[PDB]
Design a protein around this ligand. Structure first.
Ligand SMILES: COc1ccccc1-n1c(-c2cc(O)ccc2C)cn2c3c(=O)[nH]c(=O)n(C)c3nc12
Length: 265
């Protein structure tokens, strides 16, 4: 674990608030004093008291992965605390929380360029992720964090039917191309301002409908360019999906759209 993750001294860490709950324990916000004396805002995942050896290894497993990534659109690991308790994973702090709950609070309040900026960031982080040989398997708006300047960063490296490609659901064929499928769903989620993919359809129907060629409809006022991008990410043949590098290239052009567009077949 300490191969990629710096051990932090707990004395350099202040806890200021409880910002939510994770699988393994409370999530908190606070501050970290760095070796250079600079103080930064951090988010802190804590491991519940009374954890088992397996929980600890799985908890900290996320940090070993996260520690190998250094990119503006991947959540930055500051370090871990294992020598004292509670055990913690400490990252940079993201003021505006999860992308999906953030967007739900601001329905139709952003410009298309702003949304594209967010989408470009996610795509760039994923381009780096796939460059490093990692498959996320859980790419979802709720796993993207967004900061006070609206910069989006991929998180949650712990590993979800609605976000999973058809072939990954069918026989666990996870590749960067199934991540690209997931990105398509995230793209829908963003243009929908945090709407749940496939709403509350039963899982079997989401599975069958998608397998039959049915796709999420264009969100309200979605530019055709962004909708077609979703459809590309959702090609049945995974070899026909664009690579993250092309997705990044596509979004950089759109950032530099007037045409505006139950599942569709
Ligand atoms: C995606 O966000 C999370 C989901 C589950 C649990 C914690 C957070 N989680 C994480 C996080 C994510 C990681 O993958 C690893 C380590 C951490 C600290 C950072 N933040 C923040 C954050 O920096 N700011 C927030 O407002 N919220 C709600 C956050 N929730 C999380």
């Amino acid at each position: 674990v300490h191969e990629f993750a710096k051990e932090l001294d707990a004395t350099n860490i202040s806890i200021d608030k409880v910002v939510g709950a994770g699988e393994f324990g409370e999530v908190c916000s606070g501050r970290l004093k760095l070796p250079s004396k600079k103080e930064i805002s951090v988010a802190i995942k804590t491991l519940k008291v009374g954890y088992t050896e397996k929980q600890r290894r799985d908890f900290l497993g996320e940090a070993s992965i996260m520690g190998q990534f250094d990119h503006p659109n991947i959540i930055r690991l500051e370090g871990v605390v294992t020598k004292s308790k509670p055990v913690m994973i400490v990252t940079e702090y993201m003021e505006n929380g999860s992308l999906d709950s953030f967007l739900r609070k601001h329905d139709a309040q952003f410009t298309v360029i702003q949304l594209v900026g967010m989408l470009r960031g996610i795509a760039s982080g994923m381009k780096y992720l796939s460059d490093m040989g990692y498959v996320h398997r859980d790419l979802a708006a709720r796993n993207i964090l967004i900061n006070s300047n609206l910069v989006c960063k991929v998180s949650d490296f712990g590993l979800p039917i609605r976000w999973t490609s058809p072939e990954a659901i069918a026989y666990r064929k996870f590749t960067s191309a199934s991540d690209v499928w997931s990105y398509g769903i995230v793209l829908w989620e963003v243009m929908s301002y945090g709407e749940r993919p496939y709403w509350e359809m039963s899982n079997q129907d989401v599975i069958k409908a998608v397998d039959e060629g049915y796709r999420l409809p264009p969100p309200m006022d979605c530019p055709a360019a962004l909708y077609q991008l979703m459809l590309d990410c959702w090609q049945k043949d995974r070899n026909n999906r664009p690579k993250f590098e092309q997705i990044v290239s596509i979004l950089d052009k759109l950032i530099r759209l007037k045409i505006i567009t139950n599942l569709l077949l």
